Subunit: 223 residues, 4 copies
């Protein structure tokens, strides 16, 4: 294709690779099958700051999409070619798969948790889990577009942190609801490795619908 | 009215809608009627970063008032028309009501907590609870006005975060005292949904008095 | 004196008033005489973000000294008149006293803790407690001078946050050692109200020595 | 040599001195030989914000290498003379040794923990512990180079915080795996003081390999 382009695909692969390794590696529970204590502030800050870090390392060389729903919302909003966008999802889907892969064999025998495979419960349906995802991936993609929107009062402070903190507060609520994915490839990675696919469809359409509707709302409504 | 104006009312509705859903949804206790553990750092960071996020998404399109006491202090300080300010409170009061609404049916049967309805105890009176609120909503509105005040040394770092962190440290103290509302509509939302109105008046006048006195102090005293 | 000057004294009084109320009010243990759980991350973030907030509200109108050791290091480094500096300590010493004052009667009957009066133990001597303070108030005053030093690469990000985070990591270690004061007036306030003065001298000379040596090192050595 | 140069060596000595004292002093467990509770968010935020603080105090006068692997990656990437780089490691290796030193005698008799000597377990091998380190010190050095790279969109927000948050999320995962060193001198300090050298080689080559490969990837591949 283009060296520029294929660097960015690389950057996209490595970035998911570290995101899901570092932050999924936080879901790890050192007291596997008791107990926890189940620290959200840990899991939550990990996953947000990890993204805030990754966009800081790679933003300038890929975009820091690092999330297929963002990629879908990018294309649906006309920002990335239809063909450019297919070389991202896969690089994001292999990056996660070998991010969790690498993780699997470096974490000991306490992984039992399922490496943290987003799994919808609390007794909720599929539509609830759809919604909880739809809604947050929204709040999150809306953060990305608002903060990354030229011709504004050069938004105060770290753009990476905003997009981080969005992931955060997003985990800071949804974790027991849905897994708090808001990211198809983030849940595609471990699903492959452990074979657990319970309600997996829910983590593609949920986050994608929310991604578009928040791509949409910025572009054609609010601006 | 004006499309500009009515976008901002929309932005105001959606923003409370996500604020109270995401952050009130954090007050949720996964061990309802035991136990907790009652993580403040969770509830606290959630509520601050949520606001820091919302002002980041919408600040540039509404103001990120997202709080009637701020709206009252805005008008009392002559910043927003008397008629503009009535289309905010209601949009903030419906936004909260359907923010909690949406929440009610996505959270399972562990909500028992009361979706987190600010309720004044610790054995305190009503005047204490008035004060604890009055005081913090002050500290908070004073942050908003200080940080959002043109003709200054273009204050270092994220203005959203400052206003976030103010909410934070504000929760980081008052939570067991008062609920740590510092926000009438934030406590108007759930009150409607659950019917629990214990000392509700206390969350309008407290935060409003504090809002004005901190709107006042900036405008006519300190500057 | 001068309205400008006496505004700043006011700003200095109010700022300690909120700092020690909000953050000392975090040391409060809702399970007084069991139990805790003794959350440092709570106490720690409270005290740092509180300062980060206060400098954000008042920095532009007083300096955000909000700490006599800083005031002593300011004067010792020739930055503030000898007479200007005496109207700060007292405004900082009344501000704390009525900050804790106001707190005393708004917190219920769980205050037993001593409103959080910095008290040197762990079995340590007085010189250890001197040092642990001396050292941190150093690390902290060195942050203040480094970050607040014109003619630099206009330091990245919130100057308030840096100075906040310094307080933080400072509490994030010293809390069980010394109380983690690094601030004479912060421990002058509650000491007055509760009458507990155990090793109180240690919180003036410790933090002041550290304040100077870090005022000194910046001014006459490192620069 | 040069006063400029030897100031920076000083700055390098003092900075590790405070980093390892403050943040290693956080690993301290007030319930030594039970129990903990083992707060990661504490240890994690301490170690990141400590670095974020140190680069803020000294960055402008040394570089804020404060980590031999960074120093090796700096030289391997041609940024620092071979002779300049030897006066850093030692200043970083004495700074840590007397940082922990000073700590040893200020912490009481609850230090038992080993002052927090990075020690590779979870049942992992040496190559796993190599990798977990190799990988993170990578993620971390890549943050340093990306954020500190002139000719970019003057990266949003605190550069110190980015480099802080990288340390953070880095601890936020690896702590039970490896100790989460990502820093040879940080683990050289306490090793000297307590005599515990279990897998110590692993904390030089791991972090150094990762340091280079992430120095390399930025310089000769991604840019
Ligand atoms: C498969 C992914 C799911 C599809 C998303 C559903 C929404 C699609 C419809 C929509 O509103 O998107 C906007 C519409 C506007 O794009 P234009 O640039 O005008 O297209 C012309 C150049 N080819 O996008 C058109 O695709 C559809 C698909 C969008 C998702 C991208 C799919 C790539 C991954 C495979
Ligand atoms: C392996 C091939 C990796 C190739 C490396 C880089 C190129 C990336 C694109 C290649 C596509 C990768 C697809 C292979 C994934 C294999 C897979 O599906 O995983 C199955 C899954 C299920 O089995 P276990 O849980 O192990 O159970 C064992 C019995 N109890 O796990 C099996 O490993 C391997 C998982 C992936 C490999 C992870 C090992 C680390 C190797 C990669 C590190 C390299 C990083 C940087 C180089 C990238 C270029
Ligand atoms: C606007 C957005 C438009 C684009 C978004 C989505 C595209 C829509 C197509 C897929 C949506 C329908 C999929 C549902 C079919 C799967 C299903 O329901 O199977 C049943 C169910 C049974 O198990 P449970 O009831 O959970 O528990 C066990 C009890 N015995 O199985 C659950 O899936 C997994 C099946 C794996 C599917 C995941 C693979 C990926 C899905 C493709 C989505 C792709 C979207 C576009 C991306 C571009 C690339
Ligand atoms: C009802 C809300 C409670 C009222 C707040 C109490 C304080 C009011 C008095 C005060 O000091 O406010 C300042 C005073 C200055 O405003 P001007 O622009 O000069 O008014 C002329 C144009 N109409 O404000 C005047 O209203 C009162 C009400 C302020 C709150 C706004 C009410 C909107 C919601 C209903
Ligand atoms: C419902 C109508 C929602 C209309 C949507 C958008 C327009 C916004 C302005 C309309 C004004 C809304 C006022 C209706 C609020 C209803 C109410 O007072 O709630 C009562 C309260 C008490 O009863 P329960 O706790 O359910 O007990 C059941 C028996 N055990 O709860 C009852 O739902 C509904 C609560 C509100 C609806 C929430 C459902 C989600 C629907 C809205 C989602 C749409 C979002 C975006 C579109 C906005 C435009
Ligand atoms: C300067 C600021 C000026 C503007 C600020 C405030 C406006 C002042 C008017 C209202 C203030 C007085 C209200 C007090 C009357 C309510 C009352 O005390 O009722 C008693 C008490 C009995 O219950 P408890 O003792 O708590 O426990 C049960 C034991 N059996 O009831 C408690 O309310 C709830 C009643 C619901 C009131 C909330 C509705 C909103 C109030 C309106 C405030 C509006 C302010 C202006 C906003 C502009 C729009
Ligand atoms: C009492 C507070 C403790 C004193 C601190 C100990 C160090 C003092 C010696 C020192 O090195 O300080 C530097 C020296 C340089 O100041 P100049 O501006 O040159 O003085 C001439 C104008 N009057 O400061 C001179 O005071 C002493 C006292 C400094 C603390 C201020 C005391 C105010 C509170 C009472
Ligand atoms: C009271 C006077 C407050 C004057 C207000 C503002 C002006 C500030 C400078 C005045 C100097 C203040 C010195 C008075 C401090 C009194 C004192 O030493 O406290 C003693 C201490 C020990 O006794 P208790 O613990 O209560 O035990 C009771 C029996 N079991 O506590 C006793 O209150 C009062 C403490 C101070 C008053 C706090 C009450 C809140 C009043 C002030 C709020 C006003 C804020 C803004 C206005 C400032 C201008
Ligand atoms: C360079 C820095 C120079 C300036 C810094 C400091 C100024 C030095 C003067 C004061 C230093 C010596 C003070 C020590 C004397 C107090 C003492 O040791 O008393 C004994 C001890 C006995 O109790 P314990 O052993 O702890 O436990 C009970 C067991 N039965 O008492 C403990 O204090 C409290 C006495 C209260 C003193 C606090 C009042 C403030 C002190 C003034 C310092 C002022 C510095 C300058 C500030 C400018 C304004
Ligand atoms: C001993 C430290 C371990 C060595 C690191 C292993 C990698 C070394 C090989 C490498 O790729 O580094 C790049 C190569 C490029 O440097 P130039 O400036 O071209 O050298 C000419 C001026 N003398 O570096 C050359 O050293 C080796 C050593 C690098 C580490 C520095 C050692 C200092 C501490 C002792
Ligand atoms: C001591 C000499 C310190 C010299 C100060 C500054 C100059 C820096 C370069 C000098 C090189 C320092 C090398 C000496 C380190 C000594 C050592 O290896 O430590 C051994 C180790 C093992 O024994 P223990 O655990 O104590 O067991 C006791 C029996 N149960 O600990 C023994 O102390 C001393 C440790 C180092 C000294 C720490 C004391 C604090 C003194 C330094 C503070 C000064 C700071 C600023 C000045 C720097 C210039
Ligand atoms: C590209 C990077 C190139 C530069 C990087 C590294 C340089 C490589 C040289 C050293 C690497 C080989 C070292 C391994 C030899 C040590 C060893 O394996 O000993 C065995 C093992 C036995 O104990 P365990 O099995 O853990 O448990 C007890 C069970 N009875 O001992 C464990 O070390 C400690 C020995 C201390 C070594 C640490 C001293 C520092 C090492 C030097 C590295 C220097 C690198 C360059 C830095 C420049 C300055």
């Amino acid at each position: 294709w283009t060296q520029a382009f294929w660097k960015a695909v690389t950057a996209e692969f490595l970035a998911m690779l570290i995101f899901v390794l570092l932050s999924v590696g936080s879901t790890i529970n050192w007291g596997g099958s008791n107990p926890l204590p189940v620290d959200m502030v840990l899991i939550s800050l990990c996953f947000g700051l990890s993204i805030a870090t990754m966009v800081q390392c790679f933003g300038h060389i890929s975009g820091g999409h690092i999330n297929p729903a963002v990629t879908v919302a990018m294309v649906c909003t006309r920002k990335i070619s239809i063909a450019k966008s297919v070389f991202y999802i896969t690089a994001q889907c292999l990056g996660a798969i070998i991010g969790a892969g690498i993780l699997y064999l470096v974490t000991p025998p306490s992984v039992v948790g399922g490496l943290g495979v987003t799994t919808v419960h609390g007794n909720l349906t599929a539509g609830h889990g759809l919604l909880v995802e739809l809604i947050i991936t929204f709040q999150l993609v809306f953060t990305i577009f608002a903060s990354c929107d030229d011709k504004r009062t050069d938004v105060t402070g770290s753009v990476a942190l905003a997009i981080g903190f969005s992931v955060a507060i997003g985990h800071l609520f949804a974790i027991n609801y849905t897994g708090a994915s808001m990211n198809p490839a983030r849940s595609f990675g471990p699903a492959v490795i452990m074979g657990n696919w319970e309600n997996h469809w829910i983590y593609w359409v949920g986050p994608i619908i929310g991604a578009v509707l928040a791509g949409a709302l910025y572009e054609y409504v609010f601006c």
